[PDB]
Amino acid sequence: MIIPVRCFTCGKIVGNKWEAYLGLLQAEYTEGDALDALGLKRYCCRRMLLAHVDLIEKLLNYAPLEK
Amino acid sequence: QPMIYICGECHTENEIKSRDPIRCRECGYRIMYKKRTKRLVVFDAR
Amino acid sequence: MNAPPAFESFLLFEGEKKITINKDTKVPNACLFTINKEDHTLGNIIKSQLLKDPQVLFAGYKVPHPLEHKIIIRVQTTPDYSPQEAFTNAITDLISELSLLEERFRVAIKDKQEG
Amino acid sequence: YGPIKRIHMVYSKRSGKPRGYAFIEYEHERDMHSAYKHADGKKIDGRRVLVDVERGRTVKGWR
Amino acid sequence: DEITPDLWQEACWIVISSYFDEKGLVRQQLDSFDEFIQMSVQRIVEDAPPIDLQAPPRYLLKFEQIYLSKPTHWERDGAPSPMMPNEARLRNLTYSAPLYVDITKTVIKEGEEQLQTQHQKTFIGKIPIMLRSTYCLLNGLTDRDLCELNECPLDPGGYFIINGSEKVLIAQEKMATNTVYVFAKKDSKYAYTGECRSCLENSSRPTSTIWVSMLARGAIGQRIVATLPYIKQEVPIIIVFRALGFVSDRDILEHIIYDFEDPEMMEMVKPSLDEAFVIQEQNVALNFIGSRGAKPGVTKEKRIKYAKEVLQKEMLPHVGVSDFCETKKAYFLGYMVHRLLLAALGRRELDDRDHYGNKRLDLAGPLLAFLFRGMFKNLLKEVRIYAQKFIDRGKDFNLELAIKTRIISDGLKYSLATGNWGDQKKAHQARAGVSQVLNRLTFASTLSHLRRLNSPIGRDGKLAKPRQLHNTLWGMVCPAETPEGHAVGLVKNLALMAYISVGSQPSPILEFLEEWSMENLEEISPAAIADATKIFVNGCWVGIHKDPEQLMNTLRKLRRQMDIIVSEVSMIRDIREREIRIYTDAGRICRPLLIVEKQKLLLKKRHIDQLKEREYNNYSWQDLVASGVVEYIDTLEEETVMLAMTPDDLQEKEVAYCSTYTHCEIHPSMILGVCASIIPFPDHNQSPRNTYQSAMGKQAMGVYITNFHVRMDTLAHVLYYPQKPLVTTRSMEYLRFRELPAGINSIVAIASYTGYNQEDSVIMNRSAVDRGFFRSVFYRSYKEQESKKGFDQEEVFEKPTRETCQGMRHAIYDKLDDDGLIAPGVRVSGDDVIIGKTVTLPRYTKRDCSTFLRTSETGIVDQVMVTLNQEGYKFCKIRVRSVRIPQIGDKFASRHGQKGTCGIQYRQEDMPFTCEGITPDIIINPHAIPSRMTIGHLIECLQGKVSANKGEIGDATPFNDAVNVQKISNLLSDYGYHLRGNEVLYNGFTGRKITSQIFIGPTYYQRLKHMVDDKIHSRARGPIQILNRQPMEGRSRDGGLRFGEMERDCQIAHGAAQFLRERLFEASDPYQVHVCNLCGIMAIANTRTHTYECRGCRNKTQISLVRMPYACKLLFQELMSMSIAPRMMSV
């Protein structure tokens, strides 16, 4: 539900690319150019950032069990 | 011995003893959740 | 339920030999090296280094099963030579090659870091 | 206790803060009376609440 | 103004999005329940007869109006409080609302001394409510408000909650009613049989099926008969016509034959006339009919009465049950025979039993109404007897105590809970399968289950005709989504754009027709029926018309303007046969289509503009239908409709194919269901494969719902890192698969690597698995409650003790708390205890009844819940969590039927790689492509490689000419890769290149819940049953495996007798008995005192020991119970 740490195929860190990836998309950047600026050349790492679904952002809409 | 429970609506830590109908003294909610245990559980990052 | 420990692949079991030598009776001057807790990383380099020795008539490696972490290396040499001696020289040659490759890498790293 | 035609929550005129009391209008007069006895003493959001028929325009000499 | 071909692809999908933004995915379920609460229930109450009872004083007890409040719950104190769905799923309650009905009781004794008493808002019973419906608390709530209630905004609803179980009503298919269908059975005494399942508009009795058959040739000719209801003997049609007041054969034929200039039909009916000519009056005909029945009255008077009420009530009730309607029944019965003659003379084609235009879908609306009707009658009944025994004593009665609200509540609760459709007593005559447990394994399964159909033909049936994919499943049902087991073709799945009618009253239509130039049935003369066209309404023959062309043009104009005629109304104008059948009944499956003018569409560009700004100008699908651009077409109307697959077919071609189109498809991909729309390029794969995938998509892991942390479900699989498919269809945006995916995009390489992926198997990357590749978690909820049924024995949650409890296993109970429930965050293994429950005895004065964990679980407690059930007793739920890592044996499957288990897990170092460090996460055997011909798997692997390297999401819409294999190849050659997807790999063990350039790319794979840890089973001297001392059945019971008959036959061929003996006797149920050598009956043995005697023979020395299976000893005992004497003679 949240961006993984490493790429399942190679092992490159991607956990630190999700927030930066979103910050670029809102800046009128293309999904390809954005992935290139982050240093993602292999189509394996690009898969992780382009095929991920941030579901945790929806899980945080529910109040917690403890206040 | 205390067995503090949590609520689903108010999230208030209320004490509930056995043989007592389940009901939140703070909000009256009838569903109670238990608190995380104090035991030391290990998780291997594998 | 049955996931074997990951460290079981590299750690030697108590009372288990790292390497066992069994003389092959089919042909003369041949042996089988059953090494435990290894993989293709060592079998190939030793295999290749053994083929380059002209006194070695047969040099091959196999994995009886991928789930296991052992390896079997067959070595056939000339009557004047010995297979154990070949398995030893092949290692000594590989060690020197890596030592030379290691030193030549530090120099290249140093030359690149400076300019 | 019954369908609500309209609901009016009063707010501070100058501060805009919630007053803490509201007026509930049910579709049928019978639906309200059912709440008079049951609604009184209800617990909403952890705080007990009281409920009585609004006398601002019913009881003579009420203020 | 006109939509150009380049902009069409954007317009069609835009129109589709508006549809799913207003209607939804389960609209057919919500609309059904909605119309049931608004109209059906109110009508069922008003349609009931006032119960007039008298000892004298009399009482009617007439109902006038109803009121259904929101779902509520009453505690022990009685304080009415609202109940949320999350509270019901947790407390195992029933999400139902009370039904309040107004009653008016007037006293009438004598002397016109009347006085009325009204009981406003009388609590008659509770009714379960459909989630997300109009009366549901979650109606109109925003995504934020639903989150406050711990509810998922994406949950489509359409299901109920009974005792905490999410139940969904499966739409049941049935043959249409009030319609004439002429079939022909090959093996029967009748050549052609014309039946008509008749039922009144407001159904109140079962379907009175009437048959109008023709006797097979071999007195003189072929005789026509009629098998009327409540009569066990065929009856000539003429006798029935005379029983209705038509004695003259001319008037009779005038109702059957409308054109006397057709001597072929007159010559075919002559045998029936000459067969019944002694009867020439209505009274004698009625007496004959009553005589043929199974209730022949000794006196001819009541015989005529029995026939009169039968022809007036049971025969064709839909045409009318009142008196003076004999003319309408005859006119219809005449048309019923007219259809039979046309079928025998070849002037008309026989009707197909599979044609869904002749079927109806019984949804929750028409379904729940049948129960409420039958039960409401039982309520008025129980109220009658109760008040009857009170007025007999000459005193008043209180209806508040007469109303047994338990009837409706427990009734609807039982039906929706068990599935048996009917009273609790008729648990065998009722049809099961309805109200199934909602599948919450993935969002696709939930949608499919909520859009599931069912044909009650019986899985036992071996006839392939009803299971075949009929041509009429187009646009209404998914041709691919269907089980592959013993229910092929019977269990279907609605299409994306399929909408089942909710129902409507034909009163306004009949008013418009009467106001029109249409002529009634009783006002016309039979001579005018020849050239005139008939007009039917819900199967009821209303009248005729002269210029039907402008009639439909008018009716169609009215439906397209949201006029008196609603969109759900079907208007079929059969041209060859002058019939014009209009339908307003429910269950008529239909779908939308773009209306077409002379040669152009009505969906101009100004519409697409308004649909783009849908959030601002509130221009939604409803405004599109009202503009006359779209039309809801049903299966029965498709026969008279000429569709166009795409606007390209409307253009001028070198050779005109049709040139007279009247409708057009929004998008051909809409013919697919939910589990089939997720498949990319399904038009490039073998059809069975697309079907097997539709059955796997429901078994794929993922995020079945966003609020999975609050729901305490008994079984739930959650995927760690879900990903949306790089190669996706433009329909997933509406299924919400992008938000709740059920798989991961994997870098798969189609190659043979060590042979561990052969025969539908795959090789996985152990390093990827170590980084969370396809990793998931298994949630299991254990529920328990302490019952205070009586002071004899009471259960209670409390930490058991070895000195007071009796049934305490050797397991340690230290993990439990003083309250008797384990705490979250604790590690629990198999055989461990999570709930310490003790029951008071009549190891003294209390026995242990703790709940242990299933074997081979090794999980951790996620959370614990404690609440009160309906009975005010303590109710605890413990949700255990277990992380399931994909290992050898776990099943994986792509979106094209390519299923297989992980043969072995190779590390990143042992796996192949390209020139760059890209190892394939999965490796499959290419042998699975040619036989299955799943080209879509290859194109998906290609479009995925282009999308990842290009920075987009591949559009794999099934029918899209703008995307082929050539364009994808050219785009891939621009990023430095082979245009055909192939790529050079290096052997990971030796680094040497692979002679064959392997095919590799991203492919969306799925993990299935069918793991090996949940299937691995072993047994060695375990428990046994009670009846027969044989191993148990199931892993939960540590049962053994079945050595079936086929195995007995196999080992017989091998000649292995000892094995066959060891398996069936020594390893299953070895036993020893003592029999008398004289009578061979089991003697009475006592090995402790060493005495053996047979009471029968009175001997105690001629005994013999026999080593026989216990099942055989049980068999002989079961035979001796039938007085059979199986004597085991050892000599």
Ligand SMILES: [Zn+2]
């Ligand atoms: Zn990578």
Ligand SMILES: [Zn+2]
């Ligand atoms: Zn609370």
Ligand SMILES: [Zn+2]
């Ligand atoms: Zn005997």
